[PDB]
Design a protein around this ligand. Structure first.
Ligand SMILES: [Mn+2]
Length: 177
């Protein structure tokens, strides 16, 4: 597998695994929502709104959107008094033959110029997975980040579970509105 269950509470499961040559573990969060797949797609489209629910987001803006792709700008906070780091993210929406929806996620540091006063997050990578249930949708959120930002790698690793846990919990509360 490589994976191992790291947390299970409030209906959410988070898996982690080592990635060779990195000091940061990859996570995979899992939750099941009473919503349709395209209800989560809408929320993930509304990047201007990330800051409203998505944890540790100080600010967010949609830069560009097509049918299949999107770019948004984020200013990230942190659980500790460290400088904020910002970044541009590329989402790519794919609908598989079976109605499963995959949103491929990718940091793109050079899309906009550096905003100086701020550290630019280096490449990140992962995806959301949205697969319909009889009555809802099964949600996967998986990310691996490389070294960068204002939070020591050793610190981000020891706290890596709280990112998908906090995100999925907030996306659940948020869809309920
Ligand atoms: Mn299910």
């Amino acid at each position: 597998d490589g994976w191992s269950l790291a947390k299970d509470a409030e209906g959410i499961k988070v898996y982690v695994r080592n990635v060779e040559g990195s000091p940061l573990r990859e996570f995979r969060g899992e939750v099941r929502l009473k919503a349709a797949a395209d209800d989560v797609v809408k929320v993930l489209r509304d990047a201007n709104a990330f800051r409203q629910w998505m944890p540790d987001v100080a600010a967010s803006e949609l830069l560009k959107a097509t049918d299949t792709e999107q770019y948004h700008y984020l200013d990230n906070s942190a659980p500790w008094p460290v400088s904020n780091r910002d970044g541009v993210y590329h989402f790519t929406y794919e609908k598989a033959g079976d109605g499963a929806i995959t949103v491929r996620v990718e940091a793109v540091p050079d899309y906009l110029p550096l905003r100086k006063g701020k550290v630019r997050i280096p490449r990140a990578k992962g995806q959301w997975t949205l697969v319909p249930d009889a009555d809802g949708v099964d949600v996967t959120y998986q990310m691996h980040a490389s070294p960068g930002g204002s939070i020591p790698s050793w610190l981000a690793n020891q706290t890596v579970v709280e990112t998908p846990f906090g995100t999925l919990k907030a996306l659940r509360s948020h869809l309920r509105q």
